Write a protein that binds this DNA or RNA. Structure first.
Ligand SMILES: [K+]
Ligand SMILES: [K+]
Ligand SMILES: [K+]
Ligand SMILES: [K+]
Ligand SMILES: [K+]
Ligand SMILES: [K+]
Ligand SMILES: [K+]
Ligand SMILES: [Mg+2]
Ligand SMILES: [Mg+2]
Ligand SMILES: [Mg+2]
Ligand SMILES: [Mg+2]
Ligand SMILES: [Mg+2]
Ligand SMILES: [Mg+2]
Ligand SMILES: [Mg+2]
Ligand SMILES: [Mg+2]
Ligand SMILES: [Mg+2]
Ligand SMILES: [Mg+2]
Ligand SMILES: [Mg+2]
Ligand SMILES: [Mg+2]
Ligand SMILES: [Mg+2]
Ligand SMILES: [Mg+2]
Ligand SMILES: [Mg+2]
Ligand SMILES: [Mg+2]
Ligand SMILES: [Mg+2]
Ligand SMILES: [Mg+2]
Ligand SMILES: [Mg+2]
Ligand SMILES: [Mg+2]
Ligand SMILES: [Mg+2]
Ligand SMILES: [Mg+2]
Ligand SMILES: [Mg+2]
Ligand SMILES: [Mg+2]
Ligand SMILES: [Mg+2]
Ligand SMILES: [Mg+2]
Ligand SMILES: [Mg+2]
Ligand SMILES: [Zn+2]
Lengths: 110, 53, 118, 119
RNA sequence: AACAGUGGUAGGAGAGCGUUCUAAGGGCUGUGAAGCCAGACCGGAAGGACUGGUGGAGCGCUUAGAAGUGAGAAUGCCGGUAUGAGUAGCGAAAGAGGGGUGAGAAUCCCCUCCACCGAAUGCCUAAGGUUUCCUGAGGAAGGCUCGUCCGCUCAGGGUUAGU
RNA sequence: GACCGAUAGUGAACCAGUACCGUGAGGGAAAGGUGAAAAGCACCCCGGAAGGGGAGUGAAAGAGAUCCUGAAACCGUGUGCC
RNA sequence: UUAAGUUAGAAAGGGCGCACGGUGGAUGCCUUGGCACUAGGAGCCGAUGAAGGACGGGACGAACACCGAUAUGCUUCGGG
């Protein structure tokens, strides 16, 4: 059985979230929470909350033992981009993509 | 100097082989059992080398 | 009445893209480069259906030459001898015997040698 | 060699003096690991002057230590604490008056932090 | 049937495919229309079916008619999204520690010492701006980082003349 | 109406001659669709919130608010062969 | 065991296929609005203050629409 959590439209660039996700994918949920806690990246606390949300869903909704959980899927999808403009020299503007992420974790029993 | 050709998906991916985080240099805390960075005080319980800091 | 672009464009382009399945990178993905590659594939396929007939004949001759020389004949003399004997077995078949039934090939080679030694 | 700590000569001296007095007063401060590592040698050299105790040693310390209140109750300056309480505590100890303990990176800039404290 | 022929730019000629609409006839469709997605099917080509999925209300077929009737190129127009790239940059400047608040603090508050301006980086006051002022609450966006903070957001308040 | 059907048709299907640009004359956009009905998700759970997982409503929630359909570029996760 | 020979397998990452998503808003269907006309009406308003505005008006912020200190409407005659 599986339990999912998603954080949609989090204001972090997908590429940066994926760096941290690649550390935890496949791991036992206890080990994953430790990695996130000790990984000094902006994505770490965000991903941690999605992981803990998925674990809570596993316990509460599906009646799954939290100590037996593994991260079975973990991925970051692109959310909608906030388009901004930075004034450059010579009266030119250059686009700034303030990108967002959809962060999915699926936990399953080992 | 500008890109003469766009970079393919493949070449971009090949370049990012090494653009990767390492797993933290972590060990189990002998006091409380949470993972800590080796040679650092445990953030959870505040212990280091069997002494409360 | 107005005719919108509609679905015809998507349908046509998608068929080209399905013909480009297996091509590398953007050549299976993007219409413009997939189109060029499918067109190029046509020219090559036409050319190579012709070259296929050249390449197999070349292969059979090489194998007949190898088998002939095991019987103490060059390919040139074998084919001359077979022509004089009136044996009309083609190179595909001779090369088939050379691989599969070499004793049968050797009889044909002996028949050729008989005419040459006249 | 010695660290520059991203500061000019005068800015660095000023910072090391600030930190030196902070450690004398508080007995335990949290700072960046690399600041803490530079502070060890500077603070321990001040404690050596304190342990000497003579007027000449006090004036040398007075050139470095900041004019800050160590104990508001007793009206004790940082210089007075160095020559009274700190010097007395480390009478029998030969060097190694401080210890650094690493805490790990802070949020805003990932800077590796450390406790430095008097032993 | 036989015989002969069938490379082709400009270009002439012919025969067709498909699109929207109309007419007439005949149909399909909530027992699932169009569209969309997939497939190893069919036709000499343009193209056309069939099956399954999605979809949730329309649509084919035949014959004829009429055209905003077919796009890969116009440094085409509009939109979206890449590449370069986790790269350049983050816009003159001194901070340090302690304490506090908070889900979270290099960045907010307080304290201490340090440092900077000082014919100004001070005080007053035009033009101009138009609520940016004050208090309480807030943290999506704006702020080149962060943010508990703000010239930002939400409330409520605030400008008193005979001289 | 053998006229358009949201890049079309008015510049404007929407609070448009608006926003925005310009000292001014003047230039001048983008932006339609939940559902038959709000029945617009009580309640529980993780979270500061956002967001989500259940539960409920509904024919449908992968119809949950720039919410009919949802192509392509582009970005990912998994892996049969190399 | 030694010698000589031969051949596998490897994946940091990548390629092709397939599956499943995300983004995005094409496509289809739809129409609140347009476009072109036909028939008929009407072709002027203003010092008795026009056109067009500004500022106001509600138990409730702003805006629209409506109205003018008689202000989200007043009288009257008809309709319903
Ligand atoms: K269908
Ligand atoms: K073009
Ligand atoms: K001066
Ligand atoms: K505030
Ligand atoms: K327009
Ligand atoms: K793949
Ligand atoms: K591999
Ligand atoms: Mg300028
Ligand atoms: Mg039409
Ligand atoms: Mg077109
Ligand atoms: Mg030939
Ligand atoms: Mg100097
Ligand atoms: Mg101090
Ligand atoms: Mg010809
Ligand atoms: Mg010819
Ligand atoms: Mg012609
Ligand atoms: Mg149609
Ligand atoms: Mg079908
Ligand atoms: Mg056309
Ligand atoms: Mg780098
Ligand atoms: Mg470079
Ligand atoms: Mg560089
Ligand atoms: Mg740089
Ligand atoms: Mg700056
Ligand atoms: Mg000065
Ligand atoms: Mg203020
Ligand atoms: Mg920010
Ligand atoms: Mg549309
Ligand atoms: Mg329009
Ligand atoms: Mg203006
Ligand atoms: Mg669906
Ligand atoms: Mg419908
Ligand atoms: Mg939709
Ligand atoms: Mg008159
Ligand atoms: Zn511990």
């Amino acid at each position: 059985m599986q339990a999912k959590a998603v954080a949609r439209t989090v204001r972090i660039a997908p590429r940066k979230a994926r760096l941290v996700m690649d550390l935890i994918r496949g791991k036992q949920v206890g080990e994953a929470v430790s990695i996130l806690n000790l990984t000094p990246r902006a994505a770490s606390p965000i991903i941690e909350k999605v992981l803990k949300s998925a674990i809570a869903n596993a316990e509460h909704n599906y009646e799954m033992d939290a100590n037996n959980l593994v991260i079975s899927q973990a991925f970051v999808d692109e959310g909608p981009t906030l388009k901004r403009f930075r004034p450059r020299a010579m009266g030119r503007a250059s686009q700034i993509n303030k990108r967002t992420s959809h962060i999915t974790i699926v936990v399953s029993e080992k | 100097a500008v890109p003469f050709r766009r970079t393919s998906k493949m070449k971009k991916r090949l370049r990012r082989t090494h653009f990767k985080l390492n797993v933290p240099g972590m060990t189990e805390c002998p006091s409380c059992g949470e993972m800590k960075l080796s040679h650092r005080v445990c953030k959870a319980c505040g212990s280091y080398n069997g002494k409360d800091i | 009445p107005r005719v919108k672009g509609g679905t015809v464009t998507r349908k046509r382009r998608k068929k080209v893209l399905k013909l480009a399945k297996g091509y590398f990178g953007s050549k299976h993905t993007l219409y413009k480069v997939a189109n060029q590659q499918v067109m190029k594939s046509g020219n090559y396929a036409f050319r190579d259906r012709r070259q296929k007939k050249r390449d197999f004949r070349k292969l059979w001759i090489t194998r007949i030459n190898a088998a002939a020389r095991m019987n103490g004949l060059s390919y040139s003399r074998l084919m001359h001898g077979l022509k004089l004997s009136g044996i009309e077995v083609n190179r595909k078949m001779l090369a088939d015997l050379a691989v599969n039934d070499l004793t049968a090939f050797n009889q044909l080679a002996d028949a050729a040698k008989a005419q040459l030694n006249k | 060699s010695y660290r520059k700590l991203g500061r000019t000569s005068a800015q660095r001296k000023a910072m090391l003096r600030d930190l030196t007095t902070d450690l004398i007063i508080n007995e335990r401060i949290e700072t960046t690991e690399t600041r803490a590592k530079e502070l060890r040698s500077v603070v321990e050299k001040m404690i050596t002057l304190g342990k000497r105790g003579d007027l000449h040693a006090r004036r040398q310390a007075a050139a470095y230590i900041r004019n800050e209140v160590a104990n508001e109750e007793n009206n004790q300056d940082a210089l007075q604490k160095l020559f009274s309480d700190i010097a007395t505590r480390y009478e029998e100890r030969q060097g190694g008056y401080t210890r650094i303990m690493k805490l790990g990176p802070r949020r805003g800039d990932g800077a590796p932090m450390a406790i430095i404290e008097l032993v």
